[PDB]
Amino acid sequence: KVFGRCELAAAMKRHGLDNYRGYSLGNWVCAAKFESNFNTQATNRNTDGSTDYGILQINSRWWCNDGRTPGSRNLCNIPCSALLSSDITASVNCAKKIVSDGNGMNAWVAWRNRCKGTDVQAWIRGCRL
Numbered sequence: 001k002v003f004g005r006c007e008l009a010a011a012m013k014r015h016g017l018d019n020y021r022g023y024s025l026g027n028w029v030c031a032a033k034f035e036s037n038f039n040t041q042a043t044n045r046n047t048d049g050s051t052d053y054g055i056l057q058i059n060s061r062w063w064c065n066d067g068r069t070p071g072s073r074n075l076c077n078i079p080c081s082a083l084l085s086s087d088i089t090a091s092v093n094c095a096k097k098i099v100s101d102g103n104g105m106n107a108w109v110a111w112r113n114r115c116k117g118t119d120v121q122a123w124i125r126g127c128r129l
């Protein structure tokens with residue numbers, strides 16, 4: 001599923017991401033925009049052999065099991081394919097663990113390079129939240 005911008009904002013808010021670990025909703029929408037273009041099915045291989053999965057591009061190196069990332073962790077205790085669902089629940093719950101690990105949203109490279117320090121509220125413009 002490719003979410004709309006306000007559609008994704010509403011789902012992220014329902015799941016408690018607005019201000020989670022101090023990150024306003026626009027930060028999360030911006031991260032999803034540049035990580036996956038809001039496409040729940042997005043997958044991208046990393047040079048180390050891990051893969052990033054779903055709307056928030058969660059990395060099998062640490063967070064989910066894909067069976068093909070030797071030596072990796074599965075700290076969200078989930079198959080990576082569950083992060084590709086049209087239901088964002090699993091991705092949000094895992095993202096909450098990631099953002100709580102000490103480095104905040106810097107875990108998301110596209111957030112650091114394209115969202116951090118910008119007018120992220122623009123990503124929720126017009127949305128009835």
Ligand SMILES: [Cl-]
Pocket residue numbers: 002
């Ligand atoms: Cl579409």
Ligand SMILES: [Cl-]
Pocket residue numbers: 002003004
């Ligand atoms: Cl659409």
Ligand SMILES: [Cl-]
Pocket residue numbers: none
């Ligand atoms: Cl479309």
Ligand SMILES: [Cl-]
Pocket residue numbers: 003004005006
């Ligand atoms: Cl959109």
Ligand SMILES: [Cl-]
Pocket residue numbers: 004
């Ligand atoms: Cl719409």
Ligand SMILES: [Cl-]
Pocket residue numbers: 004
């Ligand atoms: Cl629209």
Ligand SMILES: [Cl-]
Pocket residue numbers: none
């Ligand atoms: Cl659009």
Ligand SMILES: [Cl-]
Pocket residue numbers: none
């Ligand atoms: Cl459309």
Ligand SMILES: [Cl-]
Pocket residue numbers: 004005006007
């Ligand atoms: Cl939209």
Ligand SMILES: [Cl-]
Pocket residue numbers: 005033
């Ligand atoms: Cl958009």
Ligand SMILES: [Cl-]
Pocket residue numbers: none
């Ligand atoms: Cl757009």
Ligand SMILES: [Cl-]
Pocket residue numbers: 004005006007008
């Ligand atoms: Cl929308």
Ligand SMILES: [Cl-]
Pocket residue numbers: 010011012014015
């Ligand atoms: Cl929802």
Ligand SMILES: [Cl-]
Pocket residue numbers: 014015016
């Ligand atoms: Cl909640």
Ligand SMILES: [Cl-]
Pocket residue numbers: 016017018019
């Ligand atoms: Cl909340």
Ligand SMILES: [Cl-]
Pocket residue numbers: 024025026027120121124
């Ligand atoms: Cl915001």
